[model samples]
Target: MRHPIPDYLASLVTELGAVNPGETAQYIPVLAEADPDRFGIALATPTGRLHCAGDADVEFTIQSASKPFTYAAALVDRGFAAVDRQVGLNPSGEAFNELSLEAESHRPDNAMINAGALAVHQLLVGPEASRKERLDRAVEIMSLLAGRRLSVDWETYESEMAVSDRNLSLAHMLRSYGVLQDSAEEIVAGYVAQCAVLVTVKDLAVMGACLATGGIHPMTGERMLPSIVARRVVSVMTSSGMYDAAGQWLADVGIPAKSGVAGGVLGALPGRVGIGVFSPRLDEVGNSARGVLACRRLSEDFRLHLMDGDSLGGTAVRFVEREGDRVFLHLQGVIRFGGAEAVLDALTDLRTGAALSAATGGGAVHEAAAAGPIRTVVLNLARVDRIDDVGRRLIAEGVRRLQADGVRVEVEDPE
Candidate 1:
């Protein structure tokens, strides 16, 4: 069936196509082969609906985007205390691959960085798992998030080995500090293998959506990781997922996101939508520049930021009617865009002829929702202590539109 949502998304990426910035990763031979102009964006709803644009289906190594999942995997295998002791939960305030650790604890600064990821990877092998079993576990964890099988990119896994000296050094340092209790080289190798998993923008979005929804796979309806593990992983991703770019990203995009060198950014907007972007170019902060820009734009366009208008708390509309089918939508509490937009939705119900059409399925005029409706609506702001300018403007226009639609629209009281 045709849907305008994906089309709108398609247009958005196409318009953002001119934004080409940043540099391709140069350390790994295979990573250097990426197309410098590649760009893609995708979004997955919490209910599993997919909307994508550009090279959304193009494949790339999951790269650092695999961090949060592996952290969750380790949490699933080892206890929280065990994992927390192995890796610090705070951002490093340095490069993602920087050679550093906490002074007192000697632990890597959170599992999103190379050192912390390596430590988490070692723990991912689990109690009863061996090398072969460990590989399978890595595959299983990613598959759970993606709701499909995902194999490691052998070429990338092999290519990264040649340039893995820094990671190897980090692993050795962790072991020397008693933070990593396994073979350094082997653990780093395993960590690289996990990062080498292939994924598309859509796949990444689906994986992020799973994380956003308390580790429950939206499509499969399966609880992949523990809810607590998902929360902890997302919390860490909020602080460390962007490496040194953490604070700036929080100030801007304001979503729990992880970026990979292989041109990918995954954002998990808990209980809402998951976003994924791909572009080979990377900023100095090691984040995908185009991806970051796209995320910031998306955050504003969709109010995806946690501290955006959603912070207005809850607002409700009680009912009371008088003149004919004239209805009073009693609004209350701090009203923001979300609450005001809901008022517009209620207005749509009244103006879309829901009374005659007998439809109340919410959102515009839908023939399938032929149930029952209200013929008139009055904005009863008596209980509304305060209405923001944004709220008032939306209601004024909404009420005018409703009146134009022949609904007996009225404003009982307004602040």
Candidate 2:
């Protein structure tokens, strides 16, 4: 049988290819020169496998999508308390380049925006660090997360730096507010350099997978950042990664993601998957337009939304065994609505000739052999860590139905 993941990804790319609804980033000359038709998508699993389609190997400048990793490096270098003091974590309703800062603290709203990102650019490599020191450090941090060496596109860097007056002004404002300890030009230069780092969709997916797997390298098993730092970075991305369109993106896609004007969008689901997409055309908020559509489709098709509330349903039934006329079911983890449904499904599957392997929640099917009739069913909940009210009631209903089938039901509930 052929693997369906790549097939689906290919179909997705073909289906969404007609969706060209925005313009390239004209403010940056290099980005504006990109081919608007170029598009790609890639997903990376925690096991380090990559599924890709279309122009997944095409390289693009990382742009503002570099902010999350840069902010993460700051969190690692200066710690959360020190970082938060200089750059607040709240979302800014203005554009990514908005010249806004918190009134009292004089901090930029969050690191996702250019103002805060410029401030964060200074926070990297400690205080009084040279521009070269910070730039090299920031690029190394990005390269480490990407699982390969990534370098700045000097052409794009020069293009952005040429028109970086607004960013330079924002940094000056931040400096006057006592938020920056470095020169405005030097800080913006470093920030622009960080944004110019080049990556492919495959590379971005791996970078996001590093974040998804709690700062561990997906392939190398290197601990890039502490778990707490990863948590903080993901949380910040969830709130402000899309600039002014952040709330709408969060409501629709329901994942922690970041986007770039160079037509890259990256999403990381904790303990699950990392997604990366690229298209040169950008939406009003500067995110890749088709990339946004692709993300929504991937989220819906794979149920990757963080707010799905699945409650461990997929692995609730830890083990199942049969002895003569009695059947034993071992359960684990929190049981909610979905989990209860899974438990009932497992019992039905077992009744209809499915044989479960030892300590596996999902039982394998045995089409040829049939298990003998079951008389007594014992639900062992000792290993179960938690059960909510709805789950408890659903289990009780299941018990009543099993009894109605003329089978004896016994639950070993210690609590």
Candidate 3:
């Protein structure tokens, strides 16, 4: 079945991009030239389905949205300890352009901010190669996440580099502090080149899905990073995804998300889905105005918050039939906290007329009854992850109650 994300995207385009007044980032020449009214939303599911609406096909520079992927690439290439040795995870508290370093270690503070992002760019392969070779790998890595070849907006890169005095200074400071290992000019150029990688909303969605699916590209089915490295990269993104707005974002949306100055936002809902939204209009915080709105709407409508996982139960179970003596149950759908309750409710309905003699927590049991004829009872616990002490006792007590009714209860535990 298709999700309702398209309809919501249409509404956001009309309500936020067209009706609301906002400004696009003008500092970057290409981004400033983008249509401020442009908007799009895309969702990439774990099943590999792509759903998108509005300007989903339009390409834009990824800007800071590229930070997370580059950070992941660095982690994959050098591992956590090596990357941490160059850039720390602590937020700098200064502006994104400020030359901030770790308090004691003197490393650039976190990969999510500009200083740290530049340091990550330095870690890309070919630290000794010419700028062209270094940038090619950066594009190559981004293309992997995008599930297709990605290009650069050269004009955007040149314009950004031309106006990037502060970034140059930050790069120099990082080199001085050992956060960056190469010439500041080459490193800063590589960083700008990464920010200029062109992508559409659909591309961003798949990129987010790569991170969500433990570094495997959902559409291409390619392993982009090892699972362990993917987890660490996600950890960094979750902790510092929004730069200065990281805290507020975590408290409200509660997902690993990143935003770009070009008006794109990508969110990774681990083990579930990936979401992407784009609109050229940006808020004061440098996040896309309409993109942020769309994210909030999606998070609330689907309970995409990180905290929502705790309440998910399990999948739905279908009562098939009784085979000679055993009752069969067929289960489908995602098994989570909420879905599990629905399955339990359905099972309770069968208790009215069925002769359940004996039941066990784990699988099917056929034991001869001493007092009467045996009636078969089957409890399917195949999808269940954990049964608390109280839950286990409850199951045991229910089985005893079934035994009193001259029925035999059995449990099937796949694990």
Candidate 4:
């Protein structure tokens, strides 16, 4: 099945990318010149593998795709409280380029929009740095997401600057409400530059994979951002990545996606996979029409949606008790990762202290320890209603490791 994924990807692109039914983004001259027939599909999995087909190597300006990323970097640089102060998490329900803010205090509606993204870009600047030296952090962040250095497309950057009236207005309004302290011109300038960071469909999927794996660079196995920040970014992406049609997209596809005017769309499924699609034609909401359609099909095929029928909750380790050389673990309900984790954590504590040797009574256990750690351990699993494969694996591996050290471990199973 995995070997045929590339074929499926290529076929999807072919089926959807054949038509040019929508307009190229016309607000910018350079953007309007995109080839309508250009299409691509790419996916990066949790295991750090990238599958691509069609024009996956074609490069384009990052555009709005850069918003969620900079928002994450801002959360890392200035903390969540500070970043949220300048933006709200509610839906704006307006077009991507529309200039608007939340009614109550006038903060940007969310980080996925232009207004909120503008606020976030300013937060990316270091406390003390040159004009570009600080803004260059966006490049560093993009590199971490893509797991490679990213270059800028100067052509799109220049075109964006020339038609910057709406964005400039947004910057000024943000200043009036105290959402921005930096010069509006400087912020917009830097923001546009960051938007010009160039990437291919394959690169964009790699970025999404980083977010999906809780900020871990999938290929390098390096931490890109803290889990807290990654969760925040993924939340916003889930709710608002599709501009005004965010709600509809989430309802049908159940995946968080961000689209660039330069004919690129990126989708990240937390702990699942990263999807990227490119096609010059767009839908009424300015999302890549082919990209959006492919995402809908892919989500169903992969069961990648958070609202899917899988329950990540269940079970727990109740408590631990010790009687002479015997250590008893109490567990209840169903055991998933959370419950399994608690059991492992308990075992770790026993291993760290002299409890493993001492609890066994002097010489009571098979090759038991002195008067410190445990000699024999029993998992009181009679009350544990169920345990997933993950839970069972943890139990097996843990017991194997401890038994290797001469401690006796047993499962109190009536079944």
Among these predictions, the greatest lDDT belongs to 2
Ranking by TM-score: 4, 2, 3, 1
TM-score, candidate 3, is 0.75
In candidate 2, which residue ranges exceed 4 Å CA deviation?
96-104, 310-415
Score candidate 3 by lDDT.
Answer: 0.73
lDDT of 4 by residue, 67-106 (tens): 8888888889889877888888977654443345546466
Q: After superposition, how far is residue 23 of candidate 3 from its true place, in Å?
A: 1.0
Q: Candidate 2, 297: how far from true, in Å?
A: 1.0
Window of ten residues with lowest summed lDDT in model 1: 362-371
The local distance difference test score of model 4 is: 0.79
| Number of the top TM-score candidate | 4
Residue 95, candidate 4: C-alpha displacement in angstroms? 5.0
Model 2 residue 62 CA deviation in Å: 0.4
Candidate 4 segments exceeding 4 Å error: 95-104, 127-129, 309-375, 378-415
Backbone clashes under 3 angstroms, per model: 2, 0, 22, 14
In angstroms, the error of model 3 at 229 is 2.1
- Give the per-residue lDDT digits (tens) of candidate 2, residues 26-69: 99667778889888999988778899999999999998889989
lDDT: the better of candidates 1 and 2: 2
Name the lDDT of candidate 2: 0.82
The regions of model 3 sitting more than 4 angstroms off are 1-3, 94-102, 126-130, 310-415
